[PDB]
Paper text:
The HIV-1 capsid is a fullerene cone made of quasi-equivalent hexamers and pentamers of the viral CA protein. Along the body of the cone, the CA subunits are assembled on a hexagonal lattice, with the CA amino-terminal domain (NTD) making hexameric rings that are linked together by the carboxy-terminal domain (CTD). Twelve CA pentamers occupy sharp points of curvature—termed declinations—exactly 12 of which are required for the capsid to completely close. Here, we identify a Thr-Val-Gly-Gly motif that modulates CA hexamer/pentamer switching by folding into a 310 helix in the pentamer and random coil in the hexamer.
To stabilize the 310 helix and thus favor the pentamer, we replaced the two glycines in the TVGG motif with alanine and proline. Next, we surmised that the Met66 gate must constitute part of the activation barrier for coil-to-helix switching. Thus, a constitutively open gate (M66A) should also favor pentamers, and indeed the CA-M66A mutant also assembled into T = 1 particles, as did the CA-G60A G61P M66A triple mutant. We solved the cryo-EM structures of these T = 1 capsids to 2.2 Å (CA-G60A G61P), 3.1 Å (CA-M66A), and 2.4 Å (CA-G60A G61P M66A). These confirmed that the mutant pentamers have the same structure as the WT pentamer, with the switch in the 310 helix configuration and the gate in the open configuration. In accordance with our prediction, the CA-M66A, CA-G60A G61P and CA-G60A G61P M66A T = 1 particles were not stabilized by the FG peptide.
Residue numbers in the entry:
A (entry chain A), B (entry chain A), C (entry chain A), D (entry chain A): 1 to 221
The structure:
Amino acid sequence: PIVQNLQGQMVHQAISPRTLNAWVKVVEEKAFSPEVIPMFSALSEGATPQDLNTMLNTVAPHQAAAQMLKETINEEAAEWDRLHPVHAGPIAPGQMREPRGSDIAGTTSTLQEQIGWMTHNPPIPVGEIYKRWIILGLNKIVRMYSPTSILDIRQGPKEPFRDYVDRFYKTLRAEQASQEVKNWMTETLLVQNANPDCKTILKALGPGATLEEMMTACQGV
Amino acid sequence: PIVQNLQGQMVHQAISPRTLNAWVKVVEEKAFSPEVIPMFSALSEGATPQDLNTMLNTVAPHQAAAQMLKETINEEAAEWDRLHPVHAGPIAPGQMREPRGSDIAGTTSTLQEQIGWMTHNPPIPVGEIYKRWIILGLNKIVRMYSPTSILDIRQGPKEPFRDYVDRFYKTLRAEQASQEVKNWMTETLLVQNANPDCKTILKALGPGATLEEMMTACQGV
Amino acid sequence: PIVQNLQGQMVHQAISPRTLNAWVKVVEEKAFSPEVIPMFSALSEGATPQDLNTMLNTVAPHQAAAQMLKETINEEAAEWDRLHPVHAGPIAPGQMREPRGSDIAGTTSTLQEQIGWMTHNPPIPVGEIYKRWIILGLNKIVRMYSPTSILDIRQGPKEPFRDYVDRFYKTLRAEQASQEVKNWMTETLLVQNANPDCKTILKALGPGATLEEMMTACQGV
Amino acid sequence: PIVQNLQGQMVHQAISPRTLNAWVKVVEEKAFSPEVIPMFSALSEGATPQDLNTMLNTVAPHQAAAQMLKETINEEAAEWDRLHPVHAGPIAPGQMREPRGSDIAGTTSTLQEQIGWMTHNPPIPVGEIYKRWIILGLNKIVRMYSPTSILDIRQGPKEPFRDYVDRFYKTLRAEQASQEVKNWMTETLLVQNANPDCKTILKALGPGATLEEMMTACQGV
């Protein structure tokens, strides 16, 4: 992250060891479940690209996930270079150069370059964009490691309706289908895969019932 | 939150990553049980409206809960605008403008505006009011996700009386009935739904016994 | 339909009784299955709006279907009037007036008006548009009478793969989901609901296999 | 088709609605069995390319079959263009232009163009060639939908020999192997897959027996 020194100048502060250890616990203990992404986003809050690569070292022992992340990051860097062609010409002395795809990812840049790029009015946030690339890679990894299809999430004969709903929506978060397909899933498949008593009540409830009304009508069933 | 710099001026400090990760763990692991509210209140202690929106991003993947929160917040902002009509007229240069409903929630304001509004003598606490709106939304969410009715909390044949009492009062906290209805519940339904031996003792104890006396008379039963 | 007399002038010829009887057999014997629509389109080939109302009388004894058709036709006529506002002003003597929604459906027009409107260079086809409105109504009717969800079409343990595919695609034709949802259905649900041996082969076949390759690999399984 | 008016001039007559309905019944009821091809050839007798596209609309709801037909037709149109290069140069006023692949299929042409092309001495039959392309596509479709291999057609213990022969030759018609392979099949596989009593008689009958002699010697067996 970025901190101000006693003289009012922006200084890079490394991630503290217990934050890094929290991220290591997330990576090594949670099997890339969907909650790895909110936790990563919280733990890399306000980070520089050099900090993000420190957090990416924890993924390297997981070769398939690390390779998927590398492919996503290379694709994003190439796309960034294509959409930001390197202008050839003079530059104002008070203006800094334009980082490349290998620079936003911190492969060839240095710490002061990233601090200066991020600390500006108006800012060009290099940490947030690299973070979004990482999150796309992690979404792909969560999709790859998902153990069940949404078609296989079915309410047990004695399972409470809220628990089935939580499992259903967690798998839906993992699968990341298209928006229209997701709407069809939540409207139709949730009712279709409920157990007989809840299914009877939900069918009687009619189409277009909100999830809150469905939870109300199935509370003790 | 708000901190003082070396020059004695109020400065906004972001929520630390492990605090945000604690909130993420609460959201993703506790299924919106009633204790989510004390934990949220502790974790957002002394926060600005911009910090509260960072904590609200964690809820967004939970669509029903996020929508219920959005509806509660929109209702509260509209009510605030109605009860605080925008006065048209001159304002003192030493006095700041009046934030709107979309400003207390931090949708259109900026960080310095919120810092200045909160840091004043006397203060107009924008963090506390937005926090109370969030807590109303969360109370509704806890009500929606509650798995059992208070009518279905019944002491097991071998369950200790203190454990049944704890389950009963936790469900009562979740359900949030009216105050008179809650008093009727704790006075009548708790005794009605106890197991036969404890029920015999409590009936012999008479009406208007305090909960402490009931716990005393049922300790090993 | 429209025929030329011996003098070269366009003349309306009524639908022959055995064509009408074929349509009656379709309506009264097929329970509004999806093939009612291709058959109706073939049997009303080149018809005038007055002929289409003769074919619509056969549906009138089926009150729910007839009412759904009437609602669809009224909606389409209102939309046509809205998108074709009645211009107030002079009209060329060699140009005919503009039919209204109640005129394209033949409620207030006469036979010669429809013949003249359809027989023109360039033509304004009143039969085709009314026919498309009828087809929208019939699609809704086929959806209403569909006995099974697409989620309930599952290959039998000894059912040949081609027969399961035919049932699946016929139900898909009946249900008329969105295009993206239909693509998801044919790509995912067809494989998910196959029987174990065909499912093993199709999973080994990999994603993005064409339906022809799936039929080839499952022929005798 | 093409008809002569009262003045002796060739006029296009549309396909009658009950002919189109017969074709619709063939498409929607017979599951693309091998007899769909003789029926299609009979029902499109003397048709123009514009009529053939009307009959092709009935196949469009069957997406796999429709796509296979479209691929076959595109391939044939490209081959026709390659073998009939568009000559650049003057043309006789009494001679019509040369239709392209998109014109014989009626995508860009008009009705009078096709009537003039077909009605000529000597004729250039555009209906017959497009019909042969359609028939190639339909042969591929019949192959795709075939439920059984020729290797799986085996005489039942009590099945009459003529019925087994009919099933065998119908599957052989569906499969459309090479001519030499088909000759090997009818000479060897038919005898190999017969039931024991008929097999004994056919082996005693010797190689090179005609099918009539085999039917004679197995009549009541």
